[PDB]
Amino acid sequence: GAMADIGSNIFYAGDATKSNYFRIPSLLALDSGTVIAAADARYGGTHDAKSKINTAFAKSTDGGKTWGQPTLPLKFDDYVAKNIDWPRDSVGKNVQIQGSASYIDPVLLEDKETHRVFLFADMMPAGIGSSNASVGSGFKEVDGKKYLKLHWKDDAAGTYDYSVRENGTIYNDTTNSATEYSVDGEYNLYKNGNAMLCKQYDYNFEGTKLLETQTDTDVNMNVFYKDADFKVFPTTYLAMKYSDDEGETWSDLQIVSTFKPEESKFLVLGPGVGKQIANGEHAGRLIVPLYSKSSAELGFMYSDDHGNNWTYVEADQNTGGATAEAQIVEMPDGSLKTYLRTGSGYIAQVMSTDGGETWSERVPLTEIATTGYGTQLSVINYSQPVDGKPAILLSAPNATNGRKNGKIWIGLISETGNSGKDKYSVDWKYCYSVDTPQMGYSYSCLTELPDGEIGLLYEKYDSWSRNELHLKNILKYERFNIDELKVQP
Ligand SMILES: CCC(CC)O[C@@H]1C=C(C(=O)O)C[C@H](N)[C@H]1NC(C)=O
Numbered sequence: 001g002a003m004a005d006i007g008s009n010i011f012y013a014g015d016a017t018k019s020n021y022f023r024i025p026s027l028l029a030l031d032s033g034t035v036i037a038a039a040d041a042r043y044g045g046t047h048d049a050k051s052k053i054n055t056a057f058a059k060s061t062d063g064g065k066t067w068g069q070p071t072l073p074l075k076f077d078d079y080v081a082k083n084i085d086w087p088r089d090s091v092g093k094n095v096q097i098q099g100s101a102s103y104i105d106p107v108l109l110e111d112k113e114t115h116r117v118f119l120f121a122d123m124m125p126a127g128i129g130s131s132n133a134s135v136g137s138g139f140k141e142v143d144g145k146k147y148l149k150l151h152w153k154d155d156a157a158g159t160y161d162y163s164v165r166e167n168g169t170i171y172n173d174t175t176n177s178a179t180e181y182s183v184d185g186e187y188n189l190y191k192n193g194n195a196m197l198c199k200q201y202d203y204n205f206e207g208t209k210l211l212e213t214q215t216d217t218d219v220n221m222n223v224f225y226k227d228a229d230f231k232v233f234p235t236t237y238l239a240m241k242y243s244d245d246e247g248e249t250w251s252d253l254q255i256v257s258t259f260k261p262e263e264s265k266f267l268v269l270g271p272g273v274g275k276q277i278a279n280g281e282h283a284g285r286l287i288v289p290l291y292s293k294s295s296a297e298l299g300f301m302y303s304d305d306h307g308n309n310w311t312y313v314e315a316d317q318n319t320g321g322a323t324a325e326a327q328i329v330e331m332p333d334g335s336l337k338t339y340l341r342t343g344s345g346y347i348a349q350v351m352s353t354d355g356g357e358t359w360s361e362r363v364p365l366t367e368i369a370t371t372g373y374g375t376q377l378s379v380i381n382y383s384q385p386v387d388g389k390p391a392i393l394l395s396a397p398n399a400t401n402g403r404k405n406g407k408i409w410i411g412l413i414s415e416t417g418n419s420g421k422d423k424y425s426v427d428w429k430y431c432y433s434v435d436t437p438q439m440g441y442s443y444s445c446l447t448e449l450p451d452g453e454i455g456l457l458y459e460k461y462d463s464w465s466r467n468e469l470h471l472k473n474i475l476k477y478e479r480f481n482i483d484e485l486k487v488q489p
């Protein structure tokens with residue numbers, strides 16, 4: 001590293017998370033000027049779920065110069081958290097942990113009006129990822145109310161005759177009667193008030209074989225685990241916790257995906273950050289992007305009551321389940337513009353004028369080259385005008401083969417003199433090249449730091465390629481002043 005690269009990683013092999021690998025950056029400057037970040041702590045190489053992944057978190061209280069040790073606010077204990085080198089040979093590289101639960105793909109959002117920070121992540125039961133998730137919500141209705149459903153070990157396969165009801169009391173739904181079992185606020189199981197326990201797994205390679213084996217370490221038996229007497233429906237869930245002390249402590253685990261459509265396979269986060277609307281009637285509305293294999297691809301969840309209740313919106317009718325990861329910016333009057341990945345070989349744009357309740361048709365963005373699978377992008381508002389115009393910024397790779405050639409762009413917003421979704425246009429005037437065109441560049445997250453500089457946390461390799469799996473120390477943090485970025489090539 002150069003002098004300029006000192007301090008250019010927040011999370012790294014050897015830090016407090018005990019992970020050798022990381023992916024999926026999230027970076028967010030708080031209204032206090034505290035700056036925070038989160039990423040996946042991918043213990044089992046860089047694989048997506050199924051695997052063993054916890055959500056890591058870290059804070060800077062000097063404007064994003066300096067970063068404290070990381071914490072793990074969303075973590076599962078069914079398999080141990082340890083530093084391990086994942087094989088990168090031609091056979092071993094493909095091997096994933098088969099039996100762990102996982103938190104994956106974070107989103108950070110602050111409510112400025114209460115000063116509350118929300119951390120969201122996808123929540124995967126044991127041995128589950130997007131690709132083997134079962135179709136369904138994971139909840140049942142009993143007399144109209146939604147309860148998390150559960151499979152007792154000695155019931156028939158696919159049979160969920162039990163539910164988590166008030167106080168965490170587990171009920172038998174065929175008889176409608178409370179059992180002697182319950183869950184606590186961590187979703188750990190209890191029998192007649194006693195903590196139920198199971199053996200933690202360790203994982204070790206012998207050659208290219210991954211041996212997942214019990215240790216003698218006891219942990220709390222959790223309904224998300226492979227070895228639980230009661231087990232959740234094996235679909236994807238949305239998890240959230242909030243903090244009122246800038247990440248010093250977290251609230252109890254929330255499973256917020258009660259709205260998961262019954263016809264959906266997966267419903268997951270567009271990682272990065274969410275948005276709080278600043279202007280218009282709905283200033284203070286919290287909105288978070290989602291996508292699904294369902295009736296719809298692109299979706300959102302929003303809250304009008306400071307995060308207590310969330311509404312799900314579908315933004316299209318696509319049943320294809322493409323990887324429609326999105327990030328959202330706001331126009332000067334409070335309307336919203338969302339940029340998203342597609343499975344169509346371009347980045348797309350959609351608009352809402354009612355604060356995220358309804359969305360226009362997808363409009364391709366021709367300025368940026370991408371692959372047919374796409375990559376996640378980061379888009380943010382900037383608080384200072386640029387050339388006297390309102391400004392947004394976009395980070396993304398810029399190539400048609402591979403994840404490489406990262407740019408940061410500056411888009412200047414103009415009134416076109418038209419009414420609805422057509423009220424504004426974006427001039428992508430500036431395009432800054434992060435590195436040499438062949439250097440890898442995948443997922444990224446921008447934030448505006450309190451001094452008006454731009455922070456960036458990004459994947460400095462190609463995270464799609466099967467030949468760049470299981471690299472260490474590829475999550476890079478850089479800072480730029482706005483004049484550096486005002487490049488026209
Ligand atoms: C969700 C489907 C999609 C299938 C390729 O995977 C996403 C692609 C990713 C990618 O293109 O690198 C990273 C995301 N972490 C992953 N999401 C999940 C939930 O695993």
Ligand SMILES: [Ca+2]
Binds near residue numbers: 281282283284285
């Ligand atoms: Ca309001």
